[PDB]
Design a protein around this ligand. Structure first.
Ligand SMILES: Nc1nc2c(c(=O)[nH]1)N[C@@H](CNc1ccc(C(=O)N[C@@H](CCC(=O)O)C(=O)O)cc1)CN2
Ligand SMILES: Nc1nc2c(c(=O)[nH]1)N[C@@H](CNc1ccc(C(=O)N[C@@H](CCC(=O)O)C(=O)O)cc1)CN2
Ligand SMILES: Nc1ccn([C@H]2C[C@H](O)[C@@H](COP(=O)(O)O)O2)c(=O)n1
Ligand SMILES: Nc1ccn([C@H]2C[C@H](O)[C@@H](COP(=O)(O)O)O2)c(=O)n1
Lengths: 246, 246
């Protein structure tokens, strides 16, 4: 329930407990992960662990605005992770701007805006990112990119627009921070676009509720969890870290 | 989190509180509803409010097995609700057997079974019910049937298969009971099919985690919530009910 959810601080706690208990799950790539299964929490902070990176977030936003399905179109030197999951032609699936703004994905943003504009109380205000053909599209031309965001639903209650984000899979360190920045962007845009449609509406952004099948940390970031466990600091440079996960 | 979720009994409590507070939300059809927004709970009981109806549940299962998109194919006299939301030709979208078993929805069940059969720890085991074109398909030929189940993800941890059900919209009285029966059916089938594939697996059914954008009761069922609020009885016949919601 929206008003009675876990917080990000409680998510940190449960991830710390999973590491302490050595409750490891082996990733498809062979490395260890720790997870929360069926996570559900209000994103009351914009990160869980790790450093800020407004600069990558702005690059990702421009890539999303371009709607390009090719990773080289990310501004600047495209990150190694995107080069690795891309197809033989540099193609991917998970351009979230394509997902919500392309006519080839059935105009998710515009139809959600139109639905809520005609019925503010509607339960049908949703942006549908994934697709049934993803069962075969996730490795087209050799890519490795099964859509992780499934749907985001928008529910206007007491003049606040709440976003229910439904994710299959979310990396705690980079994925959550980037995805949170993106979902908050879309929510603020929907609030603004609805308010611009009619000055009587006077909507505000509500809560972003994060629901994840597997919310996980890769072994290469266990040091961030361990350092926080010991100190309460949500970030440390890998250079400065002292512990058993170097 | 799977191990630290709300229960059905807590869902009843919060629905009772919403009714007592008269926190009403007007349905698209004009009637009042009460809701939990962003509900997330373990389905530790197979119903919330209302009487059992194994007989309708078995009829719905046969309809799902047929994969028919036409409501007359529901065994017996098709319920009035299905006649009302169907198209001019008797057609709908929400045949969940079509969703997971039709090749026209990209073989969701079979691909999820194959994914988990090759990698038990996979995060990509999912059955995708809704589709991006639902933004236009929900009222094809005059129907009124926007898919309410978005995705169901299956995560095998400690040899238990957990189902994370992601729903846009769920009627507490009929919808949840019917949908729970269906999701438990699919989960038990996936457990059985995986175990039949390899006797070393020895999987068991885990928890079914229910995540709903709007989990709601229509005004025509407020009497069930009110009676439970006053007595703790999860059912009463409309005839026998005494109260302000007759
Ligand atoms: N299979 C796999 N696929 C993935 C991810 C993963 O984990 N594994 N991660 C998902 C989330 N996307 C990102 C995007 C950027 C980065 C990243 O690494 N960012 C650097 C910048 C990198 C750079 O600019 O060179 C930073 O410090 O912000 C990580 C995950 C995308 N797909
Ligand atoms: N817009 C709208 N669309 C809906 C529902 C709704 O609420 N409103 N409800 C959703 C869930 N499906 C059902 C299926 C059956 C019944 C129902 O009514 N069952 C009777 C049997 C009816 C009969 O056999 O005649 C019983 O007592 O079990 C209600 C919702 C389907 N779509
Ligand atoms: N928006 C996204 C997309 C992907 N990922 C991460 C989650 C997983 O770490 C990986 C996808 O791997 P899989 O498809 O095996 O879940 O990418 C993420 O955190 N956020
Ligand atoms: N599997 C389903 C499908 C539908 N519904 C109910 C939820 C809503 O009461 C209605 C759909 O209306 P809307 O599309 O306006 O949410 O049907 C449900 O409870 N379970």
């Amino acid at each position: 329930m929206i008003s009675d959810s876990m917080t990000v601080e409680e998510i940190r706690l449960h991830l710390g407990l999973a590491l302490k208990e050595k409750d490891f799950v082996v990733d498809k790539t062979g490395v260890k992960t720790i997870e929360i299964i069926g996570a559900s929490f209000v994103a009351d902070e914009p990160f869980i662990f790790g450093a800020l990176n407004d600069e990558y977030i702005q690059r990702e936003l421009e890539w999303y605005k371009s709607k390009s399905l090719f990773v080289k179109d990310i501004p600047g030197e495209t990150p190694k992770i995107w080069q690795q999951v891309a197809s033989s032609k540099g193609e991917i699936n998970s351009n979230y701007g394509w997902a919500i703004w392309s006519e080839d994905n059935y105009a998710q943003y515009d139809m959600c805006l139109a639905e809520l504009g005609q019925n503010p109380d509607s339960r049908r205000g949703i942006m549908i990112y994934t697709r049934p053909s993803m069962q075969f599209d996730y490795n087209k031309d050799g890519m490795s990119d099964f859509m992780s965001t499934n749907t985001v639903q928008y529910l206007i209650r007491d003049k606040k627009i709440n976003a229910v984000v439904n994710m299959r899979s979310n990396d705690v360190v980079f994925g959550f921070r980037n995805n949170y920045a993106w979902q908050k962007y879309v929510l603020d845009k929907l609030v603004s676009d609805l308010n611009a449609g009619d000055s009587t509406r006077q909507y505000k952004a509500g809560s972003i509720i994060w629901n994840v099948g597997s919310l996980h940390v890769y072994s290469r970031h266990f040091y961030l969890v361990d350092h926080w466990w010991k100190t309460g600091e949500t970030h440390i440079s890998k250079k400065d870290y002292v512990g058993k996960y170097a």
